[PDB]
């Protein structure tokens, strides 16, 4: 009988996170730590609903003015409002001048794929696959796969994590930027680097957008963490509002799914910097044909918490502590692992572990070193040295900050 | 004075649909009439939430064991489980041997993109953009959108309305089947026809799959109102079933927009049907990178409604409830709208009206006979003659109906 048309297709390859936790989760050993989460967590590993998401749940619950109707192509007109609001400040000149446009998409993932499409079909010519697209060493998994999906051939890397220094090797970077064809591409990280928490300090951002403006590279920012980042919202987005000052035309991902720990609710926002504001009607109307296809409109939950929030001087400043909260949680964990670690006499230099900023931390272990920490430690992270500061708590500090000694001290 | 990056970036052409209705919103006439609308009304032209939707929401809303993190890249396995049963059937043969799959997607439109992109890659050979896909002459407009989108080169329609019998051309359509290469896909309208309202009776099916089995021609169906269209959900998904039990490998999507009225929180179900076991778990795993690089996981809020509803039983019944309301609040305005038409001795058979099935009725009105009824009696259709009868009402069907009389009558 003619075979299944399916007999042919191949099982794909596993992703190793999704190994590591099944791993940990199946370690009996009382002591586990699993610090290759992907997510906030609490003092207790908890997930942590926010405060104010479960006061504006309730909110909506009971409001019967609301229905379910579709919403418009782009989104919910308050919650692209609020979003492009929140990254490019009150009183940006872009917002000002009328040159932003913004499409509520499928978290940040959705706002990078649209952003994606969108430049494949429009942008440096007429349906230019050829165009270089740079993104960092190393960088957040997804990237080079949406970008590939969207029909980019020529996919780069600009140097970024400098392994011996356990910094940002600003001269490669640079010499990356700097002999960049025109036009190329570049998916910048606002703030807290994913991987590493390694983000260029102010000074740095300005050589890079110096380059960048010379040659004609594209800002693709990706926003995942303003304000989760440092606990202050203006201080978080300070690059892209550079990038608006100094002229650019960019394009910025935003995800709402940590900084409002709405992972679930896939809240994202594609932001759209113009140098005029005809262009602004122009370019939203050939976003709506891309989304149309792809989920045709977008959900409303998530963008109605958020738009609700950000819209309530009360509700606002409430976030902005929930915010604060997880931030302040995170600072605690690195200084009190360095210190630790410090105390210990650990070789080598841990300030990189308080210098990194968010949840993620590129610790610098090697791999046989991370083969030590799980097989004998019980402790889980992936095979590049990358830790969830999240993973810590009060309780296994200690145990952590002992293990590493080890694996440092006794593993080569 | 460097020039945007936007500068060249074309307006796209608007959606006649949006136009219309943004027409109508505007129209000053008493009279007006919106048959031009895409969703479910009341008798009083209002949205409806459905009871048991407003009764759920209440119940999530208040279960503090609820949190945010994502879920898996397929979605909620409750509602891929439970969704998949209602198209099947319980004592479905493909679930007791567990040769289906479903992936949860962003309403019936992520279900169709996810599964274009899928055979775009692995069916018929690898990245096989060859393979002819077929869609009914007329369809839903957003068919052919994803299907090129996805990379296929070679769209065709196969014959489906007859414009002078009023109905559905079976003849033409089997010959289209008879003379599509072996191994053509073939996007099905499951059940309520869009936009026509005309189904294939059971034994006009059974010729049908006659057919694809000898060609192997490969069914893609499209369920967007499964019992929203006869008022009963083991009525509405036979086809369905029976391609199943003929042994059929096929793809349904499936979206709960219509028949849970969750529009905006865009559910929707890719159910996967293989000749083994094994198959699925090796598709999945293709699924996965697709929806990984799209939207990355899917939303939880609208997938909860649906998983709890249809798995508690007393629910369950308040929905098959709800649904036959919405089902029979429309078989009520199609057997009105006739009967009047018929009073009233209207040239040309009506009984098309009564025959027709869903939301959507084709009237058989010509694109002249449609200008007058926008232009002279505030009635808002499309040029295709198609109409929403969720638009009609106790209170409008005499003016529409007396209306239909004149356009027939002074205009041809």
Redesign the interface.
């Known amino acids: 009988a003619?075979?299944?048309?399916?007999?042919?297709?191949?099982?794909?390859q596993?992703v190793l996170v999704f190994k590591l936790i099944a791993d940990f989760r199946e370690d009996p050993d009382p002591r586990k730590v699993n610090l290759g989460v992907?997510?906030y967590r609490t003092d207790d590993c908890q997930?942590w609903?926010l405060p104010v998401?479960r006061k504006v749940?309730?909110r909506?619950?009971n409001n019967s003015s609301?229905?379910?109707?579709?919403?418009p192509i782009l989104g919910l007109a308050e919650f692209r409002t609020c979003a492009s609001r929140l990254a490019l400040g009150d009183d940006s000149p872009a917002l000002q001048e009328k040159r932003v446009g913004g499409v509520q998409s499928?978290?940040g993932?959705?706002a990078l794929?649209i952003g994606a499409e969108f430049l494949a079909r429009?942008?440096?010519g007429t349906n230019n696959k050829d165009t270089p697209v740079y993104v960092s060493s190393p960088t957040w998994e997804?990237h080079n796969?949406?970008f590939?999906?969207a029909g980019f051939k020529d996919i780069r890397s600009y140097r970024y994590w400098d392994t011996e220094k356990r910094g940002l090797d600003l001269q490669g970077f640079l010499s990356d930027l700097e002999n960049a064809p025109e036009?190329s591409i570049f998916v910048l990280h606002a703030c807290a680097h994913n991987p590493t928490g390694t983000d260029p300090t102010p000074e740095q951002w300005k050589q890079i957008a110096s380059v960048m403006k010379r040659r004609?590279l594209?800002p693709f920012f990706d926003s995942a963490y303003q304000g989760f980042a440092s606990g202050n919202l203006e201080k978080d987005a300070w690059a892209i509002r550079y990038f608006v000052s100094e002229g650019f035309?960019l394009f910025c991902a935003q995800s709402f799914?940590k900084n409002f720990?709405?992972?679930?609710?896939?809240v994202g926002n594609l932001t759209v910097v113009?140098?005029?504001p005809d262009?602004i009607?122009?370019?939203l109307?050939?976003m709506?044909?891309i989304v149309?296809?792809?989920?045709?409109?977008?959900?409303?939950?998530?963008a109605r918490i958020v738009a609700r929030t950000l819209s309530d001087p009360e509700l606002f400043h409430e976030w902005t502590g929930n915010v604060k909260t997880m931030a302040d949680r995170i600072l605690s964990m690195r200084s009190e692992l360095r210190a630790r670690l410090e105390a210990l006499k650990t070789p080598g230099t841990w300030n990189h572990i308080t210098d990194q900023i968010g949840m993620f931390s590129f610790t610098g272990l090697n791999p046989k070193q991370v083969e030590y920490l799980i097989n004998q430690k019980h402790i889980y992270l992936l095979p590049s040295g990358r830790i969830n500061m999240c993973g810590l708590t009060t309780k296994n500090l200690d145990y952590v900050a002992t293990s590493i000694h080890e694996a440092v001290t006794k593993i080569q």
């Open positions: 003619p075979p299944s048309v399916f007999a042919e297709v191949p099982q794909a596993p992907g997510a997930p609903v998401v749940e309730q909506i619950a609301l229905n379910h109707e579709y919403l499928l978290g993932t959705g794929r429009w942008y440096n997804n796969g949406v590939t999906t036009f004609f594209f035309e799914s720990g709405l992972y679930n609710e896939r113009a140098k005029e262009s009607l122009r370019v109307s050939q709506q044909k149309r296809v792809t989920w045709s409109n977008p959900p409303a939950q998530g």
